[PDB]
Write an enzyme that holds these catalytic residues in place. Structure first.
Site, PDB file in Angstrom:
ATOM      1  CE  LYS A 211     -18.633  26.556  60.265  1.00  0.00           C
ATOM      2  NZ  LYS A 211     -18.945  25.214  60.842  1.00  0.00           N
TER       3      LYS A 211
ATOM      4  CB  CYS B  39      -3.765  35.353  58.856  1.00  0.00           C
ATOM      5  SG  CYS B  39      -4.311  36.549  60.063  1.00  0.00           S
TER       6      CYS B  39
ATOM      7  CB  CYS C 253      -3.820  37.723  64.226  1.00  0.00           C
ATOM      8  SG  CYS C 253      -3.398  38.716  62.757  1.00  0.00           S
TER       9      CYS C 253
ATOM     10  CB  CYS D  81       0.545  35.439  57.932  1.00  0.00           C
ATOM     11  SG  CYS D  81       1.549  36.394  59.092  1.00  0.00           S
TER      12      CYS D  81
ATOM     13  CG  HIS E 244       1.545  38.426  63.337  1.00  0.00           C
ATOM     14  ND1 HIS E 244       1.659  37.980  62.033  1.00  0.00           N
ATOM     15  CD2 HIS E 244       2.810  38.557  63.807  1.00  0.00           C
ATOM     16  CE1 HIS E 244       2.944  37.839  61.738  1.00  0.00           C
ATOM     17  NE2 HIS E 244       3.660  38.178  62.797  1.00  0.00           N
TER      18      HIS E 244
END
Ligand code: FES
Ligand code: FES
EC number: 2.6.1.3
Lengths: 69, 64
Positions: A16, A33, A35, A44, A48
């Site tokens: 996890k 991020c 995505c 990020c 995306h």
């Protein structure tokens, strides 16, 4: 018919994936991020855009800023 | 290739949230799974998602 994973590839040895940062360590701006396609996860890197274009999705990052350093 | 976000704010072509740390409480828990009923905050929905799909996603926490 079967629901897809969201994260395809990132740190699959971790059951996890959670990131936790202290505010006091934060930079003036961090772009995180949401995505699970960034090559610099948890940050990020613009992945995306490709994801949204390829899948028709509409996901984007979480930006955390400081008003003052 | 499957979408990640199935249902959230689909009239927004790219969902971005921006917060200033000075506005936050001692702990903020942000959803990275797009299944929370309290998006952009994490409500624990990631657990069911991981169980159903075999995934391993979780939130991003900003704390004091
Ligand atoms: S690269 Fe994933 S949200 Fe931008
Ligand atoms: S509900 Fe989405 S990361 Fe917890």
């Amino acid at each position: 018919r079967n629901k897809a994973m969201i994260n395809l590839h990132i740190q699959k040895d971790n059951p996890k994936i959670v990131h936790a940062f202290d505010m006091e360590d934060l930079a003036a701006k961090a772009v995180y991020c949401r995505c699970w396609r960034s090559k610099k996860f948890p940050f990020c890197d613009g992945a995306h855009t490709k994801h949204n274009e390829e899948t028709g999705d509409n996901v984007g990052p979480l930006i955390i800023k400081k008003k003052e350093t």
